[PDB]
Amino acid sequence: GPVSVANHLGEDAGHLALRRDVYSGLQKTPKSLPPKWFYDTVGSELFDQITRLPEYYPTRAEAEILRARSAEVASACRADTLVELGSGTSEKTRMLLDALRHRGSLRRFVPFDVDASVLSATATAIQREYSGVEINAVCGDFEEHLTEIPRGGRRLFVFLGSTIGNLTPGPRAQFLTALAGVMRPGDSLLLGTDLVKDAARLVRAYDDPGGVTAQFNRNVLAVINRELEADFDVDAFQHVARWNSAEERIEMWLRADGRQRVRVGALDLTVDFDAGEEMLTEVSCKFRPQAVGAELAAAGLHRIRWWTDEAGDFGLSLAAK
Numbered sequence: 328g329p330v331s332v333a334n335h336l337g338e339d340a341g342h343l344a345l346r347r348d349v350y351s352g353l354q355k356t357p358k359s360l361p362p363k364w365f366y367d368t369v370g371s372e373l374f375d376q377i378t379r380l381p382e383y384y385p386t387r388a389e390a391e392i393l394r395a396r397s398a399e400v401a402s403a404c405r406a407d408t409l410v411e412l413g414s415g416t417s418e419k420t421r422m423l424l425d426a427l428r429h430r431g432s433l434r435r436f437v438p439f440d441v442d443a444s445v446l447s448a449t450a451t452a453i454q455r456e457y458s459g460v461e462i463n464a465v466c467g468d469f470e471e472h473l474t475e476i477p478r479g480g481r482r483l484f485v486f487l488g489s490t491i492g493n494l495t496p497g498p499r500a501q502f503l504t505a506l507a508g509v510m511r512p513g514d515s516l517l518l519g520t521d522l523v524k525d526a527a528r529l530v531r532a533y534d535d536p537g538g539v540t541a542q543f544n545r546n547v548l549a550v551i552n553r554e555l556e557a558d559f560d561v562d563a564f565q566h567v568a569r570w571n572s573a574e575e576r577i578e579m580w581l582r583a584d585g586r587q588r589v590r591v592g593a594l595d596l597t598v599d600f601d602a603g604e605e606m607l608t609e610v611s612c613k614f615r616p617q618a619v620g621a622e623l624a625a626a627g628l629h630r631i632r633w634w635t636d637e638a639g640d641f642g643l644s645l646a647a648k
């Protein structure tokens with residue numbers, strides 16, 4: 328089937344996005360960076376390592392649900408079209424495409440991500456593995472281009488891996504409202520959410536003993552050093568995984584070992600790290616079954632299926648517009 332990529336991101340939109348997030352976030356108390364920047368080439372294959380760690384249960388828990396419920400998803404949503412908010416590269420992507428193809432209604436696949444090069448390779452590989460499917464990849468961001476997602480058909484929107492947990496409630500309700508707004512009656516959303524559980528398990532999931540998560544987090548400093556010509560002593564910064572009991576969310580911080588002076592070249596900015604000062608690089612919100620259904624409701628979607636894995640570690644929601 329035909330491949331198309333629509334690119335709505337200017338060529339240096341990424342680079343200018345980084346300037347805004349670093350100039351702003353390194354200048355608030357406490358210092359904070361958005362998690363969209365972990366995923367250069369190094370971080371991305373670090374993340375790939377994380378998903379295989381025995382400690383990082385989310386990837387396997389959601390895979391387990393999907394291996395068992397993908398057929399029910401296809402049959403319940405009846406979609407002819409898979410819209411992925413994500414790069415389209417996981418095995419879970421195939422499970423859902425297979426479920427729709429098996430039921431005979433897979434006509435189009437819409438991968439939606441910010442890396443046009445990754446959409447390109449996804450689209451070429453799905454074109455090779457799924458004949459008869461139109462691939463319409465959209466390079467854009469959630470903030471602006473949900474409306475550029477193609478129309479015509481019954482669409483199942485897919486947002487897996489508890490990515491929505493990387494958004495704090497305010498940004499989170501506003502995204503789900505935006506998503507419900509581009510959905511048409513009879514379209515549906517499959518949403519993955521990591522569930523609240525024992526904190527010692529949560530912290531271990533974000534601080535594996537061999538420190539792959541530690542590398543992945545520290546990597547954001549290398550990215551900022553390379554792309555904004557800053558001078559972070561990457562090794563003087565410790566990965567710390569914290570469980571915020573009140574906000575019910577995992578927090579990734581970077582602790583400075585002793586006072587640091589960091590000049591961000593490309594920004595004409597110098598920031599001061601107190602010795603032992605911590606910087607928020609990621610939040611990872613954990614959910615309760617009822618609260619997910621209520622957020623979906625708040626956004627104008629009606630949840631019709633909830634699933635957990637065998638252990639109650641992780642949840643998938645299927646909600647309809």
Ligand SMILES: O=C(O)[C@H](Cc1c[nH]cn1)NC(=S)NCc1ccccc1
Pocket residue numbers: 366374377385414488489490492493532533540609611
């Ligand atoms: O909330 C989480 O567990 C993780 C972050 C995390 C895991 N371990 C330490 N940090 N975020 C995820 S899967 N985002 C989805 C994504 C995947 C690939 C490329 C871009 C975006």
